[PDB]
Amino acid sequence: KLDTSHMRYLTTDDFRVLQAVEQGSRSHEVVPTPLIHQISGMRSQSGTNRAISDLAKLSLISKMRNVKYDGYRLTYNGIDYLALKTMLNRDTVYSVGNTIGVGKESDIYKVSDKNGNPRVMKIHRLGRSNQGANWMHLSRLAANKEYQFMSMLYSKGFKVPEPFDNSRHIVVMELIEGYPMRRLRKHKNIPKLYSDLMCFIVDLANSGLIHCDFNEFNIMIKDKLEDENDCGFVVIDFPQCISIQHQDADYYFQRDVDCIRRFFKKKLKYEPKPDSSMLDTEGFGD
């Protein structure tokens, strides 16, 4: 499940240690005993096994007593507590918790910044947790790769939220007070936003990545402005992204024509007005 309350008993004795050993467990997986002092330049016996027995219960490290290849490992909190400690180190998180939000490899953890406006610490833990050979290798790098693939239309004039930091599993997404298409009740400009669903994948073919995945939780009419309700689009549609070279676009292009025809008609019995558009234009006008 989850533990959070095994962290605040430490001192400076682990702060010099961490990203020396985090770049030291990557240079040299499971670390034996007399190295926590000597990766960080910490001294041999000035508050040392006191501090390592302090770290021992806290589950960010564990005493893996194997046969002369001992283990001090920076359990699952070696990423988790220590990325909270990393955001304490990389000047974003100042304490833990105003947090509500649940996924699988994306938990929404509602925080307030160094500025004071809120953002969200989303955490990546796939397999629940199952953190092993690639599962740690994924949530380290899928926090880094999806730090690189949430700006594919923000530069190009369209709406993708911006990532801030990629500390070990943590991806910080302002915070978005959304209203998905299952929460909403009525709309004021209906026939514009059906033909703009042909036209968003028009926009997605400019950047070279066609996105599909549209359920009833997707398109947030959000809160940029609270009072006058200048809303916006948050488009949670990303992970059905396919390189167009692969031979599955025979049924991706035809999705752009005759698959969105239900939601503005049925949800929003009101049979629709507008025209549409293909993506045969976007093959050349990239």
């Binding site: 959070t4 309350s5 962290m7 605040r8 008993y9 430490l10 909270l84 304490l88 304490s95 833990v96 918790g97 105003n98």
Partner: protein
């Protein structure tokens, strides 16, 4: 005011009679047996109107249950009533009819769903 029918008929009734016209989940209470726990309450009531500045305000005499039923007869006296600890002062009138004295309770520092400030006292500041 008790039913709309004549007030010199209704006020001094016991745990007997009209409820034999009323349904059996509140007939298996009030038309079975009077439960005379408010009978020596009258004997302390008949002194709780004497030495007051009369017709106005008697003393808050305490009462600490949640299934006890008051009968309307006693216009002009005050009793303090269980709300979990303390004794809510009630100038006893015919303005409560067969409902609990221990219904005077919503016992919490209020449920923080609009201002969640005491939830902020359980979270983690962290070294």
């Amino acid at each position: 005011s008790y039913r709309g029918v004549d007030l010199e008929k209704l006020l001094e009734m016991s745990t007997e009679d009209f409820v034999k016209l009323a349904p059996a989940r509140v007939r298996r209470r009030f038309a079975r047996g009077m439960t005379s726990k408010p009978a020596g309450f009258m004997k302390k009531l008949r002194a709780a109107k004497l030495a007051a500045p009369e017709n106005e305000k008697p003393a808050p005499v305490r009462t600490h249950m949640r299934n006890m039923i008051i009968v309307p007869e006693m216009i002009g006296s005050v009793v303090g009533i269980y709300n979990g600890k303390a004794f809510n002062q009630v100038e006893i009138r015919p303005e409560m009819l067969g409902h609990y004295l221990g219904e005077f309770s919503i016992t919490y520092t209020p449920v923080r769903h609009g201002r969640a400030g005491a939830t902020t006292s359980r979270f983690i500041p962290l070294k």
